């Protein structure tokens, strides 16, 4: 094994041991998806109210 | 009431185990995909170990050890024996073997040039005396292959000058107890051993399928199968020794060595599900009464006379141990 | 000093956030009224604990935290709890009616109406930061708010804070405490949408916590309080490096650097020990380090013996010196199956904090002299994904409950799109560890 | 504040509705004057779900009483808890509905429905955050069946995003008033398929059999039947009325129980059902009985179908470890009766406050494909008359056409086959 990067301070210490070496969508796009889902809800409600109106 | 599922329709052993479970009246079989089981008789390949032990309120047990394939694949068995300190490159009961990808081909040529120089290649088996014809045959295939020294001096049964191998059935329960079934079987060749004719693969191969397709199948014993009582009597009459002293002590030692070596890798002692598994060990005996390990089978079939006893023993020690209801095994202590 | 903002979303995130900030105050000696006698720089400072606490001129130490939930009952217990004086009303955001265990309702329907308010309140906290390094987000997979609104928030945070790191603490659904049948749907939907916006995510399976509470704490039927006090101890062990002096994992970027070499495979496995009943012998460095390789102590039940490691961090609290860690590691490596991938060093990064773990007075956890949390990025955690994706497949083949999601304006194609991403994620784990 | 608006319509709907408010008022410590007199804050913690707060901390049921004749309502007003109800919430006519769906739905009920929607609106307007509505009614009469489903349709038009829940009493020739009950029920069921999120199917056949066989009541009255219903209604609403984690509101319950929108008809059950009682019940006994067919209120054999979803509610002081234990016991013993393509489809809740006169009880709510037997029964009785157009003149006299009956029959047979589809899947 090999210990490396041993740092010590008052509240503790840290180090590394090696056992072996090796061998986004924009604001516009998000708003678009939110409004498209909103419009699909509005369309489904309008179809219901149309059904109830019949 | 205990519940189990069946997922390998081709298993001879566990088709009988499920029968005995239903015969107790205290076990109930479910559909293949029902996750609410106590016992799974799983498929051979890609058993979903990751989905076991996650059903609230159910103790779940499967008939396979995850990771046991390393012992039951010929290539990985050779690598395991070489690279494991517990077994080591020194290992005396395992034939000198080398893994050849179509890799340790240069270390094989070195030990071969030092040198009887007959080897055998297997994954479709070639037995040759020159290394060039072996390596050419491996590269003609696409699967990873292994070659090992062919046992040029096997113990030959008389009369017949006959080769044979010993199959031992070993059950390892969820506590990693190692149980050796007291009844083994000898798969015997029917033709006299021919040290100058390795092209004829009938007197050199003792498999049941190969001997049932040699014109002496069933001559000396039924189905080329000799059981332990007769073999022990032969050893006493012919060689003034016993099966236990001359062979079985070495068999029990090899079974213990192999299974203890992988125990930390496959044990389910503190796992969220439990495992047991039935293993088929294949041994070879030379003329000096030294036992060699040939192969470990992870999904073995049983001897047709021994199905009833061995499967009941599976229910007794592997299943009812975890699920109690309302010895044919030799416990190999370790 | 660089500040960290914590965001708690939905019931699980909020109740776990409560447990964590109660624990942080005990660890840093902050009283429930917000006063901290050991802090001599009254009204400001750039100490390590200031990463998580701002300060008022009156010497009150205020969490850099925002709580958001779409119904008010859980956050009202924060407004009236032991640490009510800690938080000011702007940090506690409540809606009227929840997402009904429906990802689409949390993400699209209700999330669209509240996202701008949430971001406004986060902006107010960010404006108090001299150098904000990013966000820690606490939420469930299974809840409609924890799944649906979190993923919307994570998208917008990537937009409004492009350079900031985002870490997650995610509660993976377990049927013996779960409240909905559709939690596998919500889990896959939120993982698909969040995957590209999270730099490192610590999954906690309620099944693992539940069984640890039963087995080690002798609690017959654990409650959320029992679960959350254990979870808070693990969370605290993970975030201690941000809150105390040290050299390991001192900023959020180092979590990714030390644990996530491949960006999509950003789900480290956490293992914690010892967990000791307060109603009950002090374990050694070797014993608690050996316990880090027992599945019974993991935050997600899986078998690391049948995967490969990409990284391993050991975080010790209490009486621990490097010599005993190295002696413990040498012993364990000779006796256990620890296989790293070939393109990674077989090594451990060790952090020691001399202060032993704080326990909540009157809680279920005994005070111990040394504890450890191991963070290991192992392919074995893909077992959790395979379990979840399988339950998804069983319901989705019959389209069971899908109408609830479509009825909120989600397209059925988002289901299969999310499921295909998860199938690719399972392929990535297979490509790396087998 | 997650308020629910309660509506009870017609003779059956008002008689079971009055008993329901009688029972839960006692559980919440509310006396017949609307003042609280209990000894636990669990009683008041979610009391706004069903009650408004009046002056002097008086609690008034958020309940609307509807009928097309004054008789039953007069009786309710004279009843034990009669003065508890808001007097403005009594909405009634004089003509009656003559056990005629068309009179309830199209003629007599049409003249009264706007007055009811005015009272619904006034209650809904003072809701901090209305969850939705619960309706109690029979399907075999005229007002509860015909006007009740008219109300559901108009309530949906006005509150499209709110949950609609009903307790619907299904007619049986064993406990019948008129021969036309299968007509009224078939017409109503199609309304419920389209306009309700959750319907508790209460079969008068099952209630009678339980009273006679199990309770040892030789001559059961409607009062005896309503004892089982109000006890069941208290059990199924326990998750809404007390602090809880599971199925705590109407929308969460529907999301957990309804995998396909039309299959929202539940078989309720209750335990214990015992003859007149001091003997302590154990958790194994509660669990076995609540899943027993003889404890279910829909006269359908669960063993003839498969459970899509199940919600179980245990009440009283008992071991949650034992509750979890026995509940997992039942699933893992008869896992063939639960569909496998909905994993973990049985959800359990526990409430500490037991019902009156019991230390422990269990309420069962099942979405089982066996409910098709109930709709098959009604369809057979409908067809036996409709093939000869018998008694149709009562309905064509109110303006209905034979084609509306044919459509209703076709609609309910479609519902039956939809259940059979998922029973074999
Ligand atoms: N460990 C833990 N898990 C919790 C807690 N609260 C809820 N859960 C789990 O979270 C999942 C349910 O999601 P919740 O967080 O309750 O729901 P939510 O985020 O508020 O979303 P909605 O209520 O649907 O709007 C289930 O798997 C619960 O077991 C908690 O306090 N601690
Ligand atoms: N090194 C060696 N020396 C001598 N004989 C050998 C040998 N390797 C293999 N054999 C013979 O070849 C036969 C088959 O060998 P192997 O066990 O590799 O094949 P196999 O896996 O098909 C048998 P099974 O499937 O029944 O376990 C054995 O019966 C044995 O007699
Ligand atoms: N369980 C129960 N069923 C009732 C009661 N009263 C009537 N019924 C049933 O309801 C149907 C008659 O409907 P009813 O409510 O009297 O007609 P309405 O006043 O026009 O709504 C028949 O199936 C009766 O068996 C009651 O008090 N309890
Ligand atoms: Ca300061
Ligand atoms: Mg083989
Ligand atoms: Mg919630
Ligand atoms: Mg009547």
Residue numbers in the entry:
A (entry chain E): 6 to 28, 44 to 74
B (entry chain F): 1 to 102, 126 to 138, 144 to 151, 159 to 248, 250 to 362, 373 to 380
C (entry chain A): 1 to 280, 284 to 437
D (entry chain B): 1 to 42, 45 to 278, 282 to 360, 369 to 438
Per the authors:
The three taxanes in clinical use, paclitaxel (Taxol), docetaxel (Taxotere), and cabazitaxel (Jevtana), are part of a large family of chemically diverse compounds that bind to the so-called ‘taxane site’ of the αβ-tubulin heterodimer (Field et al., 2013; Steinmetz and Prota, 2018), the building block of microtubules. Because taxane-site ligands stabilize microtubules and suppress their dynamics, they are collectively called microtubule-stabilizing agents. In the case of taxanes, one hypothesis is that they preferentially bind to a specific conformation of tubulin. It is well established that tubulin displays two prominent conformations that are related to its assembly state: a ‘straight’ conformation present in assembled microtubules (denoted ‘straight tubulin’ hereafter) and a ‘curved’ conformation observed in unassembled tubulin (denoted ‘curved tubulin’ hereafter). With the aim of providing insight into the mechanism of action of this important class of anticancer drugs and into the tubulin-taxane interaction, we solved the high-resolution structures of three different taxanes bound to curved tubulin by X-ray crystallography.
Here, we solved the crystal structure of baccatin III the core moiety of paclitaxel-tubulin complex at 1.9 Å resolution. We thus decided to approach the issue from a different angle and started off with baccatin III, a precursor in the biosynthesis of paclitaxel that contains both the C2-benzoyloxy ring C and the C10 acetate ester, but lacks the C13 side chain with both the 3’-N-benzamido phenyl ring A and the 3’-phenyl ring B moieties. Notably, baccatin III is largely biologically inactive despite displaying micromolar affinity for microtubules. We found that baccatin III shows detectable affinity (Kb 25°C 3.0±0.5 × 103 M–1) to unassembled tubulin, which is in the same range as for other compounds that have been co-crystallized with tubulin, such as epothilone A 8±3 × 103 M–1 and discodermolide 2.0±0.7 × 104 M–1. We found that the ligand binds to the taxane site of curved tubulin with its C2-benzoyloxy ring C stacked between the side chains of βH229 and βL275 in the leucine-rich β-tubulin pocket lined by the side chains of βC213, βL217, βL219, βD226, βH229, βL230, and βL275. Its carbonyl oxygen forms a weak hydrogen bond to the main chain amide of βR278. The C10 acetate is exposed to the solvent and, together with the C12 methyl, is within van der Waals distance to βG370 of the βS9-βS10 loop. Furthermore, the oxetane oxygen and the C13 hydroxyl accept hydrogen bonds from the main chain amide nitrogen of βT276 and the βH229 imidazole NE2, respectively. The C4 acetate is buried in the hydrophobic pocket made up by βL230, βA233, βF272, βP274, βL275, βM302, βL371, and the aliphatic portion of the βR369 side chain.
